Design an enzyme around this catalytic site. Sequence first.
Site, mmCIF file in Angstrom:
data_model
loop_
_atom_site.group_PDB
_atom_site.id
_atom_site.type_symbol
_atom_site.label_atom_id
_atom_site.label_comp_id
_atom_site.label_asym_id
_atom_site.label_seq_id
_atom_site.Cartn_x
_atom_site.Cartn_y
_atom_site.Cartn_z
ATOM 1 N N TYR A 203 -9.183 -6.659 76.983
ATOM 2 C CA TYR A 203 -9.516 -6.256 75.616
ATOM 3 C C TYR A 203 -10.332 -4.992 75.539
ATOM 4 C CZ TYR A 203 -14.269 -8.116 76.190
ATOM 5 O OH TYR A 203 -15.549 -8.394 76.639
ATOM 6 N N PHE B 188 -17.341 -0.515 71.836
ATOM 7 C CA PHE B 188 -18.584 -1.141 72.318
ATOM 8 C C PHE B 188 -18.406 -1.947 73.605
ATOM 9 C CE2 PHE B 188 -16.840 -3.814 68.886
ATOM 10 C CZ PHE B 188 -16.616 -4.985 69.592
ATOM 11 N N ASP B 189 -17.160 -2.210 74.001
ATOM 12 C CA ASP B 189 -16.862 -3.002 75.197
ATOM 13 C C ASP B 189 -15.384 -2.918 75.557
ATOM 14 O OD1 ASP B 189 -17.095 -4.742 77.300
ATOM 15 O OD2 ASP B 189 -17.358 -6.544 76.084
ATOM 16 N N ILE C 227 -15.651 -16.003 69.413
ATOM 17 C CA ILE C 227 -15.741 -15.808 67.974
ATOM 18 C C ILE C 227 -14.441 -16.239 67.295
ATOM 19 C CG2 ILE C 227 -17.618 -14.095 68.022
ATOM 20 C CD1 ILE C 227 -15.412 -11.931 67.751
ATOM 21 N N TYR D 258 -19.391 -11.349 63.982
ATOM 22 C CA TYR D 258 -20.865 -11.564 64.056
ATOM 23 C C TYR D 258 -21.585 -11.596 62.707
ATOM 24 C CZ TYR D 258 -19.776 -11.170 68.920
ATOM 25 O OH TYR D 258 -19.196 -11.376 70.128
ATOM 26 N N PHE E 4 -10.169 -5.252 67.790
ATOM 27 C CA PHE E 4 -9.946 -5.509 69.220
ATOM 28 C C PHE E 4 -8.511 -5.269 69.583
ATOM 29 C CE2 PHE E 4 -13.737 -8.171 68.596
ATOM 30 C CZ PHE E 4 -14.439 -8.062 69.779
HETATM 31 C C1 LIG Z 1 -24.795 -15.371 80.527
HETATM 32 C C2 LIG Z 1 -23.659 -14.659 79.908
HETATM 33 C C3 LIG Z 1 -23.378 -14.759 78.411
HETATM 34 C C4 LIG Z 1 -21.875 -14.966 78.241
HETATM 35 C C5 LIG Z 1 -21.196 -13.705 78.659
HETATM 36 C C6 LIG Z 1 -19.828 -13.691 79.178
HETATM 37 C C7 LIG Z 1 -19.087 -14.974 79.415
HETATM 38 C C8 LIG Z 1 -19.151 -12.373 79.484
HETATM 39 C C9 LIG Z 1 -18.196 -12.012 78.343
HETATM 40 C C10 LIG Z 1 -17.136 -11.070 78.930
HETATM 41 C C11 LIG Z 1 -18.990 -11.445 77.142
HETATM 42 C C12 LIG Z 1 -19.207 -9.940 77.159
HETATM 43 O O1 LIG Z 1 -20.087 -9.612 78.221
HETATM 44 C C13 LIG Z 1 -19.883 -8.262 78.635
HETATM 45 C C14 LIG Z 1 -19.696 -9.327 75.833
HETATM 46 O O2 LIG Z 1 -18.603 -9.296 74.928
HETATM 47 C C15 LIG Z 1 -18.795 -8.613 73.724
HETATM 48 O O3 LIG Z 1 -19.081 -7.219 73.936
HETATM 49 C C16 LIG Z 1 -17.466 -8.736 73.030
HETATM 50 O O4 LIG Z 1 -16.608 -7.672 73.021
HETATM 51 C C17 LIG Z 1 -17.109 -9.879 72.328
HETATM 52 O O5 LIG Z 1 -17.302 -9.815 70.985
HETATM 53 N N1 LIG Z 1 -16.560 -10.979 72.847
HETATM 54 C C18 LIG Z 1 -16.193 -11.045 74.280
HETATM 55 C C19 LIG Z 1 -14.682 -11.314 74.348
HETATM 56 C C20 LIG Z 1 -14.240 -12.564 73.578
HETATM 57 C C21 LIG Z 1 -14.720 -12.474 72.122
HETATM 58 C C22 LIG Z 1 -16.206 -12.085 71.956
HETATM 59 C C23 LIG Z 1 -17.065 -13.277 72.224
HETATM 60 O O6 LIG Z 1 -16.716 -14.446 71.593
HETATM 61 O O7 LIG Z 1 -18.043 -13.263 73.017
HETATM 62 C C24 LIG Z 1 -18.788 -14.478 73.163
HETATM 63 C C25 LIG Z 1 -20.049 -14.273 72.362
HETATM 64 C C26 LIG Z 1 -20.947 -13.064 72.594
HETATM 65 C C27 LIG Z 1 -20.395 -15.294 71.356
HETATM 66 C C28 LIG Z 1 -21.636 -15.211 70.496
HETATM 67 C C29 LIG Z 1 -22.722 -16.134 71.081
HETATM 68 C C30 LIG Z 1 -23.966 -16.073 70.194
HETATM 69 C C31 LIG Z 1 -23.621 -16.564 68.799
HETATM 70 O O8 LIG Z 1 -24.769 -16.482 67.952
HETATM 71 C C32 LIG Z 1 -22.515 -15.697 68.201
HETATM 72 O O9 LIG Z 1 -22.205 -16.251 66.933
HETATM 73 C C33 LIG Z 1 -21.339 -15.396 66.185
HETATM 74 C C34 LIG Z 1 -21.286 -15.722 69.081
HETATM 75 C C35 LIG Z 1 -19.137 -14.660 74.652
HETATM 76 C C36 LIG Z 1 -17.833 -14.636 75.476
HETATM 77 C C37 LIG Z 1 -19.970 -15.928 74.961
HETATM 78 O O10 LIG Z 1 -19.214 -17.063 74.608
HETATM 79 C C38 LIG Z 1 -20.392 -16.078 76.417
HETATM 80 C C39 LIG Z 1 -21.534 -15.184 76.809
HETATM 81 O O11 LIG Z 1 -22.276 -14.516 75.871
HETATM 82 C C40 LIG Z 1 -19.934 -9.231 72.936
HETATM 83 C C41 LIG Z 1 -20.288 -8.435 71.667
HETATM 84 C C42 LIG Z 1 -21.154 -9.357 73.849
HETATM 85 C C43 LIG Z 1 -20.826 -10.092 75.145
HETATM 86 O O12 LIG Z 1 -21.963 -10.162 75.993
HETATM 87 C C44 LIG Z 1 -22.952 -11.044 75.483
#
Ligand SMILES: C=CC[C@@H]1/C=C(\C)C[C@H](C)C[C@H](OC)[C@H]2O[C@@](O)(C(=O)C(=O)N3CCCC[C@H]3C(=O)O[C@H](/C(C)=C/[C@@H]3CC[C@@H](O)[C@H](OC)C3)[C@H](C)[C@@H](O)CC1=O)[C@H](C)C[C@@H]2OC
Lengths: 121, 123
Positions: free
Chosen positions: B40, B51-52, B71, B97, B114
């Site tokens: 992605y 941003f990623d 998400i 978000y 995305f």
């Molecule tokens: C110890 C490790 C943490 C663990 C990290 C990983 C497994 C590595 C994984 C590649 C994440 C990326 O790491 C480089 C990075 O991906 C982003 O850049 C991104 O493009 C993104 O939007 N993604 C990732 C791809 C799937 C959709 C979405 C997501 O659903 O992500 C989910 C997300 C952030 C959900 C939030 C959680 C908080 C709530 O409050 C909010 O509620 C709305 C929803 C991720 C997968 C979490 O389930 C799991 C984690 O966080 C985020 C912008 C920030 C995130 O890093 C934090």
Amino acid sequence: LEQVHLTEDGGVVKTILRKGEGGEENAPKKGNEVTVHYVGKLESSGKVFDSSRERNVPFKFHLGQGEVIKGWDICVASMTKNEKCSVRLDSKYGYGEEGCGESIPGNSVLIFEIELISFRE
Amino acid sequence: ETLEQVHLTEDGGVVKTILRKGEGGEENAPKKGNEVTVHYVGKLESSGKVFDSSRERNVPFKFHLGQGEVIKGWDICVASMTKNEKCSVRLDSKYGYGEEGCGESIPGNSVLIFEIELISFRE
Ligand SMILES: C=CC[C@@H]1/C=C(\C)C[C@H](C)C[C@H](OC)[C@H]2O[C@@](O)(C(=O)C(=O)N3CCCC[C@H]3C(=O)O[C@H](/C(C)=C/[C@@H]3CC[C@@H](O)[C@H](OC)C3)[C@H](C)[C@@H](O)CC1=O)[C@H](C)C[C@@H]2OC
């Protein structure tokens, strides 16, 4: 259980729940891949915002690269194989003023239970 | 010249533009609970800034489909895809978000774009 401070500002404090294995061959080094299980919750509300246990699949990352929040690099560098800990992270070592989604508010203290399962080069 | 913009929700909040069609055969479509593997690239609609990118770090992303591991806009989008499909999905902030945003890169109330490629999946 004793509190282990991993920074001088109180922002990363590790409580060891289950001591891991001894010996240097059992502590991971910078750049190693580590495999962990974790559960992250907010200190203030106790609510879980992220859990590898809930996904039923451990999480892997390379240590000391900034691939994770600062408090994680600092915490995991202190662990040994099979250690399970509870680490309290001030927001400075977490998601800071911004937070991430409703479940991680800005300026939130985070509590992670982290289990270091294994690591490799 | 084919524009295919698939509206996956009634509120217009998840719109998947198909960039490359998946392999044919319903066997190339994942089911809820399956582990899927994707690449992605995420960017903000407002600024256009990336941003990623999973491609940039060379680490494909895996999750179990339709279980809230990601998400909501992602669960909805990926459920609609077939093997090898490449899409660009527009998510309103309520599928991302919300008013909170995420970190320094994603402001509150951001529409997210995305590019997602469904590489493979399994049970
Ligand atoms: C110890 C490790 C943490 C663990 C990290 C990983 C497994 C590595 C994984 C590649 C994440 C990326 O790491 C480089 C990075 O991906 C982003 O850049 C991104 O493009 C993104 O939007 N993604 C990732 C791809 C799937 C959709 C979405 C997501 O659903 O992500 C989910 C997300 C952030 C959900 C939030 C959680 C908080 C709530 O409050 C909010 O509620 C709305 C929803 C991720 C997968 C979490 O389930 C799991 C984690 O966080 C985020 C912008 C920030 C995130 O890093 C934090």
